Ligand binder design. Structure first.
Ligand SMILES: CC(=O)N[C@@H]1[C@@H](O)[C@H](O[C@@H]2O[C@H](CO)[C@@H](O[C@@H]3O[C@H](CO)[C@@H](O[C@@H]4O[C@H](CO)[C@@H](O[C@@H]5O[C@H](CO)[C@@H](O[C@@H]6O[C@H](CO)[C@@H](O[C@@H]7O[C@H](CO)[C@@H](O[C@@H]8O[C@H](CO)[C@@H](O)[C@H](O)[C@H]8NC(C)=O)[C@H](O)[C@H]7NC(C)=O)[C@H](O)[C@H]6NC(C)=O)[C@H](O)[C@H]5NC(C)=O)[C@H](O)[C@H]4NC(C)=O)[C@H](O)[C@H]3NC(C)=O)[C@H](O)[C@H]2NC(C)=O)[C@@H](CO)O[C@H]1O
Length: 540
């Protein structure tokens, strides 16, 4: 007679291809990429002949087999593809095979193949759009936004984007390499702990707790291997297979290492570490380089060189070559992007007409034109055009596009920036003809999180009532609110100025729109980005 029917032993059923060490703070120790997950199953036979061969099946297919030598057994074997499997133990002899009931086992991998799709409802004022214009609609999500700002990946309005960028992935290095981080309390020290035992100029994760271990919706169980932002982004990729999720390296405080990459020893180590990072974290679809800025004038006053332009072009070419090789290894398309200054003084330190051949998209940071960093020379921080009172204004969106076009950059590469925050001043005074921007200020406006900066959500919620004046400058294409009694002045984007940027993109055949930063919108800005580029209301 055939063997008795085995009972699968109670035991762990959750396994991982990329293992996470739950008591490690250094990135070298935190993650271990294997070629396959080690899986184990045990069984008991409560009734009958134990058979002569025992097998473990996954969806009917043998993953292990061995002699059946008593009433209990254990099998250890490797599984090299992520997902959920129906696992059975079968005992066989010459008269037949008798299979257990199925038990599901979960084999985790960093493409999110083990996770349910994170498909959450739109919140606040977000309305559903189809991505059918063919234009970029992008936004940055910040790693540290999950604490005070309480803005997690399940709150992103992800159906209304083509591109979701993750700010920011740091480059390892201590004194003289990341000195700009020492302005943020505990930040420099945090990176040195993550990078312990790791070479400088390799990428790492700045806050491993936020990125991988904080409990979040959909990834709360203790033995879910990937939690935090990266676990939720994997499940978001399962819900939105065509969303491009790009890691962004750099930003204001993590850009110092790029200024050493004229040494090709360092540049090659960096590029190899990006390759390894994308092999490790398979939910990401390329890399965004946010080097602020070639030539200097970023956070560190002691960096910047005439060599930086050449280094930027080399870096992009070598990044592209690495991503092209990864792309043919995997069958996937990988993207290379960069966030760049929109000021013409910074643009013309780089030959973007050459670098564009390596790049899918240029994110033109057409914002921060003005703000509480200068208390004397006030203006619209993100306007399309100059205002009527100063038609020679240098920093406008159109001037940054035109600088790129004059180099020979193709228009379709250029993605225009929108701000989901305002900048502003207090104590504005000495202005003519009721235009507050012709005066000077005494300090920054009171910000939501930091001095001088206000989330758009708070502008709309608090500063469009009471004593606040609202004006839409139709020459500049820019809104501003002004409180005359204290001289508080805030310059920002709204649905109408975004609509003007979107029409301008369509008119000039540019590549689309992107925004900083997704947590600060209430929905009005991203709704207008989508509508103004011609995306149809609704869902697919
Ligand atoms: C055109 C022209 O030429 N004009 C010129 C201008 O361009 C130029 O100005 C520059 O212009 C650039 C563009 O051209 C622009 O850059 C780009 O644009 C973006 C916007 O401008 C810019 O944005 C910057 O980005 C920087 C980073 O690079 C941001 O910096 C961040 O700031 C945050 C403060 O708000 C920091 O935060 C803190 O983060 C720490 C983490 O490290 C966090 O700590 C956690 O705290 C919690 C406590 O609550 C702890 O949690 C507790 O504990 C448990 C767990 O332990 C928790 O689970 C629990 O919940 C919690 N409970 C409690 C109660 O206890 C947790 O443990 C803590 N810490 C850890 C990790 O251990 C703090 O909470 C955070 N605080 C807050 C308030 O959030 C953050 O760290 C910091 N990030 C980094 C990486 O540094 C800026 O905010 C941001 N600004 C804006 C406007 O948003 C981008 O960088 C650029 N983008 C791209 C795409 O490239 C330049 O920024 C701009 N610079 C200037 C000066 O403006 C000017 C000037 O030269 O010149 C003109 O000419």
């Amino acid at each position: 007679a055939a063997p008795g029917k085995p009972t699968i032993a109670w035991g762990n059923t959750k396994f991982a291809i990329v293992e996470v060490d739950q008591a490690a703070t250094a990135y070298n120790n935190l993650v271990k990429v294997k070629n396959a997950a080690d899986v184990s199953v045990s069984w008991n036979l409560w009734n009958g002949d134990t058979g002569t061969t025992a097998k473990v099946l996954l969806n009917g297919k043998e993953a292990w087999s061995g002699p059946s030598t008593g009433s209990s057994g254990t099998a250890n074997f490797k599984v090299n593809k992520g997902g959920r499997y129906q696992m059975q133990v079968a005992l066989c002899n010459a008269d037949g095979c008798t299979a257990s009931d199925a038990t599901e086992i979960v084999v985790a991998d960093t493409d999110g193949s083990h996770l349910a799709p994170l498909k959450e409802p739109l919140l606040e004022k977000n309305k559903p759009y189809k991505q059918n214009s063919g234009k970029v609609v992008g936004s940055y999500f910040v790693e540290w936004g999950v604490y005070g700002r309480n803005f997690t990946v399940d709150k992103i309005p992800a159906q209304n984007l083509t591109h979701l960028l993750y700010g920011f992935i740091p480059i390892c290095g201590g004194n003289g390499i990341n000195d700009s981080l020492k302005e943020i309390e505990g930040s420099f020290q945090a990176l040195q702990r993550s990078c312990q035992g790791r070479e400088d100029f390799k990428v790492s994760i700045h806050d491993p707790f936020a990125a991988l271990q904080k409990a979040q919706k959909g990834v709360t169980a203790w033995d879910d291997p990937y939690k935090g932002n990266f676990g939720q982004l994997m499940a978001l990729k399962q819900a939105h297979p065509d969303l491009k999720i790009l890691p962004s390296i750099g930003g204001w405080t993590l850009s110092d290492p790029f200024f050493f990459m004229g040494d090709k020893v360092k540049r090659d180590r960096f590029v190899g570490s990006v390759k390894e990072f994308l092999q490790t974290w398979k939910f990401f679809d390329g890399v965004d380089i946010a080097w602020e800025f070639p030539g200097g004038k970023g956070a560190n006053p002691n960096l910047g060189s005439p060599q930086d332009g050449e280094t930027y072009v080399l870096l992009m070419k070598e990044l592209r070559a690495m991503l092209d090789q990864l792309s043919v290894e995997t069958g996937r398309k990988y993207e290379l992007t960069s966030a760049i200054s929109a000021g013409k003084d910074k643009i013309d330190k780089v030959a973007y007409n050459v670098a564009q051949n390596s790049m899918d998209h240029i994110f033109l940071m057409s914002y921060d034109f003005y703000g509480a960093f200068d208390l004397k020379n006030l203006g619209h921080q993100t306007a399309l055009n100059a205002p009527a009172w100063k038609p020679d204004t240098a920093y406008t969106t159109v001037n940054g596009v035109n600088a790129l076009l004059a180099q020979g950059v193709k228009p379709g590469k250029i993605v225009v920036g929108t701000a989901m925050y305002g900048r502003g001043w207090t104590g504005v005074n000495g202005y003519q003809n009721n235009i507050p921007f012709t005066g000077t200020a005494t300090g920054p406006v009171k910000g939501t999180w930091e001095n001088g900066i206000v989330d758009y959500r708070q502008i709309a919620g608090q500063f469009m009532s009471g004593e606040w004046q609202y004006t839409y400058d139709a020459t500049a294409e820019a809104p501003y609110v002004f409180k005359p009694s204290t001289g508080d002045l805030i310059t920002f984007d709204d649905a109408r100025s975004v609509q003007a940027k979107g029409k301008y993109v369509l008119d000039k055949q540019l590549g689309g729109l992107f925004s900083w930063e997704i947590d600060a919108d209430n929905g009005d800005i991203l709704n207008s980005m989508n509508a103004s580029l011609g995306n149809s209301a609704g869902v697919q």
